[PDB]
């Protein structure tokens, strides 16, 4: 099958092509997922293009061994298959510095849980793993995951983009909805950490139930959704951040529509920011403004005309097909491994030598690459991440143009949001919608805090004989000099006779 | 002593063991850059005691014909070194064909033939997650004596993991019942930044929200005391606990985190609060050393109710003595273990409280042995000897059994957990040293000996919030979730325009309004 190419050195690839404990599960039980097929084709295009490029690996062939993984449900077997050498046998020994595996590097899984699972196994051998879509911040620990790298930013930068979007439009007062998953809780906690340093108050955080879109919903789950939407309706906050997988939100937004809720700004995380299934729900355009934070697209030139004993034969993908924003991560991962190998072999144009390589040295070289690919400079931060651009997209429903329209771009090395464009709002006159917990003071009014959140305060007039200096304090009045007085709520003193 | 040689024994069937028999200083924990071996730097007595418990259980089983009559049961114990790499090496060694030094990449479990029948799993939950995920592919049955994190209950990712200790969810259900009994509606929830504490906070926040307990603040406290951000974070947590006016705090945190939090709380002079503890702190390997515990205000929490092993100390001393005798030895996995004498393992260590984990190890051995006894369809004095059992065959019986520890029946449920009772322990400071007193029990229902409760003064603490307001009041939501309200009384000259959160409106000029009134009134 096309899952395999022979060569002098082989890359391993893990992609999810498909969506009684004694019964062994099989991927064919699940429907095809086209995104994973696109990513597989991205890897194949990258490797064959590298084989065509005489200036990168002259006379050396990159092969590959690609294996389908049903997300978390099969992660052990492919790793053993990659690690074994002679007669599909894998020796157990204390020191592996002299051992050669079937593959020299792995283009690792998609899900953060599966990435960690594979990393804990490959860490024993220091076989390098590069991953393309796992944004979890925990992967930055190289004591815990020494051999793992990423061609994508982490949740740190997504939350930074969210918070700077909030700051730019001066939103002080937000709501956070999270899934029950580790993903939702992780991102909710991270956002809670980030906002407190920047002056943004979370009105309340609430957890969505783990529903599935086609299946029936129980009465208590329906009531749970009703309660959450009631909390949304009662609150004065109108900026809502949702950390949930896309499949779960169909029921939630159906309930929101049923209650005739409208007038919010919805901030989408990368896990649902660009979902067509949610987008095609025609009535979402009436709930408010949808903004989504996602990795920025990079077009591969030649890719379109190229595209159009187990777990290596899945014929159903083609007719299911008949991932643009993630493709570049896989492409650049393959190119990173290729450049690291080109360095490791001591190679030069038309003058390669086919030296025997042990993966732990290729890891050391992979940490060292720095080159321009497709007009972007890709190199690994010491914490293992490549600095690719993020973007903010607004959902549009005019089918004359693309569903998701870029409205801002974020730079992780400069760590700031830039090139903001004209968002078209739901407001009556295209004015920026504002969410603030309390209105700003008149001059000569002191703030009196209310409750826990910093943004909550009463505005109270200064009494005669006292004044408020906004450059000096705002939470209590200060007295006039012994021969001065003031006009009650006033910033300044005046002389008594 | 020739002690590390006692970690392997022959038999017809063999049990693997993962124990914290050694460790290393922090200086070792740099990034790994070449795949060399990791040395045995430091000894650990806890692992030795747990290994002794497993050895004792297997010795008893080999003496008493009640289980596996006519067969000999062996063991093969390895150190985790508290290190995933070393743990993975040991796990791989367990799964290799007997006599061989390698493992084969077959596609499904039925093609393997590992050298051990079952693995008595690691001490910590991190290694439990890792090794459970690895073992599940081979359907190797794994029984843990210490790993309580509830994520391991999932049969989809952990189809072969079992434990003889309850999961955190049962402890937190007991805690929720405790809060519900004393009507502590308004509380703060804290947890350690480790996965233990994060999952604990998730579980508690899910359970409390369903029963109407309103969490004022939900936050994480760090494991370490080495950066200014951590000092600031504990100061901010103290600020949150103070400003919310909470009097009862639930603290699902590891002992190091609690030690940090309490030391800084004493440093900053926090006022007394009720602190609801978790087992890993309440058993206090570290916290109870603090000079000024009694100022923290009150400590209370649940603890396991398992049985006890009277003979264990004499067994340990006897076998250390045997390991000290060259005439016995005439008949490494931890080189530092050989340097240890009886006086280094004094009885004062065993008389403390480690009984729970020691008994859990004993019971894990007995669970595996009973499961094998069932699989071999044993009679009195006879067995189905004509075949050799593979681990995945034992797994079928292990779900559908009851096994006997010392005068205590236990059963694995559909999620691989045991069911166990709890004591409710309260710290008493009227003694010249803090000591645990039993004040209640939990067995799915909470029984309190309230006449015995040691509250400060002749009063019981309270912390509450309004679920609904009166008619003549304006609402205001509070809490980490918008669950409950604080009430505003409308002062004269203003009126409650809406029966809602909307602030009271100033009175119409040609009218007036008295206190608490809902409308403007003609002044005449």
Residue numbers in the entry:
A (entry chain A): 25 to 43, 52 to 340, 358 to 371, 381 to 555
B (entry chain B): 23 to 353, 367 to 388, 393 to 563
Paper excerpt:
The sweet receptor is a heterodimer composed of TAS1R2 and TAS1R3,3,4 two type 1 taste receptor family members that share the distinctive architecture of class C GPCRs: a large extracellular Venus flytrap (VFT) domain, responsible for ligand recognition; a cysteine-rich domain (CRD); and a seven-transmembrane (7TM) domain that mediates G protein coupling. To address this gap, here we present cryo-electron microscopy (cryo-EM) structures of the sweet receptor in the inactive, unliganded state, as well as in the activated, sucralose- and advantame-bound states. Unlike other class C GPCRs, such as mGluR, CaSR and GABAB receptors, where agonists stabilize inter-subunit VFT interactions to promote activation, the sweet receptor is activated by the rearrangement of a TAS1R2 VFT loop, which destabilizes interactions between the lower VFT lobes and the VFT–CRD interfaces.
We first determined the structure of the human/mouse sweet receptor in the absence of sweeteners. In the unliganded (apo) state, TAS1R2 and TAS1R3 show a highly asymmetric architecture, and their extracellular domains are markedly tilted relative to the membrane plane. In our apo sweet receptor structure, the two subunits pack closely against each other at both the upper and lower lobes of the VFT domains, as well as at the 7TM domains. This sharply contrasts with the apo states of mGluRs and the calcium-sensing receptor (CaSR), where the dimer interface is restricted to the VFT upper lobes (LB1s), while the lower lobes (LB2s) and 7TM domains remain largely disengaged. The tight packing of the sweet receptor is facilitated by interactions between VFT domains and CRDs, with the VFT LB2s held together by loops extending from the CRDs. Phe519 and His520 from TAS1R3 CRD are wedged deeply into the cleft between the two LB2s, effectively clasping them together, whereas equivalent residues Ile510 and His511 from TAS1R2 also extend into the VFT layer. This configuration reinforces the dimer interface and would enable the VFT domain of one subunit to directly communicate with the CRD of the other subunit, potentially allowing efficient cross-subunit allosteric coupling. Notably, such an arrangement differs from other class C GPCRs, where the VFT layer and the CRD remain structurally separated.
